[PDB]
Each structure stands twice: as structure tokens, then as C-alpha cells.
Amino acid sequence: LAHSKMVPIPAGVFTMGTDDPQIKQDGEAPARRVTIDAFYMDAYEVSNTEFEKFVNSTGYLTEAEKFGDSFVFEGMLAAAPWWLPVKGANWRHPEGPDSTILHRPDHPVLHVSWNDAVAYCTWAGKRLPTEAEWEYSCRGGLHNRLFPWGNKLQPKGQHYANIWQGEFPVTNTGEDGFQGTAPVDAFPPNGYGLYNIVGNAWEWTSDWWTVHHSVEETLNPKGPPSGKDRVKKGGSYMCHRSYCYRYRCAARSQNTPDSSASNLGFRCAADRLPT
Ligand SMILES: *[C@@H]1O[C@H](CO)[C@@H](O[C@@H]2O[C@H](CO)[C@@H](O)[C@H](O)[C@H]2NC(C)=O)[C@H](O)[C@H]1NC(C)=O
Ligand SMILES: [Sr+2]
Ligand SMILES: [Sr+2]
Numbered sequence: 673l674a675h676s677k678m679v680p681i682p683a684g685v686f687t688m689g690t691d692d693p694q695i696k697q698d699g700e701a702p703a704r705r706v707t708i709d710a711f712y713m714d715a716y717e718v719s720n721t722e723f724e725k726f727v728n729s730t731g732y733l734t735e736a737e738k739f740g741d742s743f744v745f746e747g748m749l750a751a752a753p754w755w756l757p758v759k760g761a762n763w764r765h766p767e768g769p770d771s772t773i774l775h776r777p778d779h780p781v782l783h784v785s786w787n788d789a790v791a792y793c794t795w796a797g798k799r800l801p802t803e804a805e806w807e808y809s810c811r812g813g814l815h816n817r818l819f820p821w822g823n824k825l826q827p828k829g830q831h832y833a834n835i836w837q838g839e840f841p842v843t844n845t846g847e848d849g850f851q852g853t854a855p856v857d858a859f860p861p862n863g864y865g866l867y868n869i870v871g872n873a874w875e876w877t878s879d880w881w882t883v884h885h886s887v888e889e890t891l892n893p894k895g896p897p898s899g900k901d902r903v904k905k906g907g908s909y910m911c912h913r914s915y916c917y918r919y920r921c922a923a924r925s926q927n928t929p930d931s932s933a934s935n936l937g938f939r940c941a942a943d944r945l946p947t
Contacts, residue, residue: 675719678712679865686808687816690922699883700922706804707891713809714939716856716867717780720773726792735785736762736932742783743933747841754841766934778855780873780937786902786929789876789938797946800878803903804893810869810921812862818920820862820869833871835919836912853909870906870919873937879903881926901926908935
């Protein structure tokens with residue numbers, strides 16, 4: 673297991689966003705041409721084992737631990753009735769006090785805030801990716817497709833990402849092999865070597881959130897200089913077309929940087945290889 677390994681994302685120009693927005697309120701449009709310099713992206717979402725190495729090294733206490741609660745999806749025991757603030761829910765106890773990560777060391781770390789993610793990535797000699805880096809990487813060398821792999825949800829009748837099957841929120845059939853999270857190395861990689869870029873855990877990016885984008889061509893854009901929420905990408909194991917079609921690379925959502933939840937993690941990026 674090399675779950676802190678990075679892959680080289682090649683230099684290129686790509687179309688960020690879409691002129692066929694599916695969630696218009698989220699500023700998926702307009703499509704815009706963005707140039708990205710070559711850099712490195714973590715192949716995997718940061719796992720419990722990998723975060724535990726960080727915590728072991730630094731003593732870091734996450735914002736959820738200090739606040740004393742975090743958001744948990746009701747189905748596995750607020751922004752929606754199915755999100756409950758649970759006392760003692762944190763990265764070690766993802767559904768609250770009497771849950772554990774002992775049996776899921778290779779699953780993505782959860783209940784990590786934007787600040788927690790920055791702390792980890794910087795500790796690791798890395799950083800968060802920008803939204804544009806994240807989206808470019810998500811698209812995996814394909815142009816204007818819905819998903820990392822193309823436009824079909826189940827190409828060749830195969831599951832390609834961990835999202836919801838069944839009637840949300842009452843019934844998760846586990847058709848794709850996982851009701852909650854999957855191991856960070858589950859499912860096929862995309863064209864650049866990334867696993868679970870869409871689905872599984874949401875991923876923080878460095879950008880402040882806005883819904884107002886120009887069509888001007890940009891180079892290594894960093895997002896707006898100010899805001900109140902940071903951008904997160906890719907959707908999660910909770911997402912279903914019926915209520916939440918956010919497992920597309922162009923999709924985007926937000927949370928305040930001190931926020932944490934049972935479907936939200938991250939991966940790191942770097943300009944160059946670290947030690
Ligand atoms: C984080 O630190 C803990 C505590 O040191 C590690 O667990 C110990 O690891 C040693 C060495 O393999 C074992 O002999 C002990 O049995 C473990 N102690 C306990 C109380 O579990 C743990 O492996 C570290 N985590 C990571 C991801 O490196
Ligand atoms: Sr699933
Ligand atoms: Sr993901």
C-alpha cells in the first residue's frame with residue numbers, strides 16, 4: 673500500500689465548467705478555457721491510516737474534536753433533516769462515540785475541516801489543489817465529459833465510483849459494493865491515475881467560493897481573493913441523481929472552512945515531489 677503516492681498531472685489547457693449546467697445555482701457555467709501547469713496530485717483521498725500518521729507526528733487536534741460535534745448522516749446512526757450534529761463524532765469516531773475506524777484504516781478520513789486539511793497537506797510537504805487543478809485532474813484527459821471516464825454512469829455495465837443506489841435517504845442498496853465509504857483504492861482509476869476522484873468522500877479545494885465566473889482565459893487560477901465558504905468537489909457516497917447530481921467533474925459545492933461532516937475529506941497536491 674502506497675496510499676500517499678502522487679501522480680504527475682500533465683500541463684494542459686482544458687474547459688472548466690460547462691455551458692450545459694445541471695445545477696445552475698452552483699455556478700457550473702460558463703465553460704471557460706483554463707491553462708494549468710504540470711503538477712502532482714495525490715492518487716488517493718487521504719485515508720485514516722495516513723491522517724493517523726499526521727496526528728501521531730504532530731499531536732494535531734481537529735476542529736470537530738475541539739468543537740465537540742460534527743455532522744453525521746442519519747441513515748448511518750443542519751443542511752437537511754438527514755444531517756444531524758452529533759456529539760463526539762470526529763475522524764476517529766465517524767458516526768459518533770461508539771463507532772470506530774479500526775476496521776476501516778484504508779477508507780478516506782472524514783470529519784476534517786478545510787483548516788484540518790491544510791494542516792495535513794502542509795505537514796506532508798504538499799498543499800490543497802485549487803478548484804481548477806482538481807477539476808482538470810478529475811477530467812482525466814477527456815474533454816467536456818460528465819464523469820472522469822466519460823458520459824455513461826455505468827460504462828460497460830460496471831460501477832466506476834462510490835455513490836448511492838436505491839431510494840435516498842431511506843434505502844441504500846449497496847449495489848456498487850459499499851453503503852458508506854469505500855477503501856481509497858477502490859474502483860478503476862481515471863486516465864491520470866486518480867482513484868475515487870468523484871464519489872466516496874467530498875474533497876476540499878483551496879478556492880474561496882463564488883458563483884460568478886468570467887469566460888476569460890486564465891492561467892493557474894486560484895479563485896476569488898475573498899469569500900466565506902471554501903469550494904468542495906466530486907460528491908460522495910450519498911449522492912444520487914434523484915436529489916444530488918454532484919458526482920460530475922464540473923459540479924461544485926461549498927462549506928465554511930470550519931465545517932466538517934461524515935462524507936467530507938480531501939486529497940493533497942504539490943508543485944513538485946516532496947520527501
Ligand atoms: C500511531 O501511534 C500508535 C501508538 O504508538 C501506533 O500504534 C502502536 O504501534 C506499535 C508499533 O507497531 C505497536 O507495537 C503498538 O501495539 C501500537 N500501540 C497501540 C496502543 O495501538 C500506530 O501504529 C500509529 N499509527 C500509524 C498510522 O502510524
Ligand atoms: Sr455506494
Ligand atoms: Sr472523492
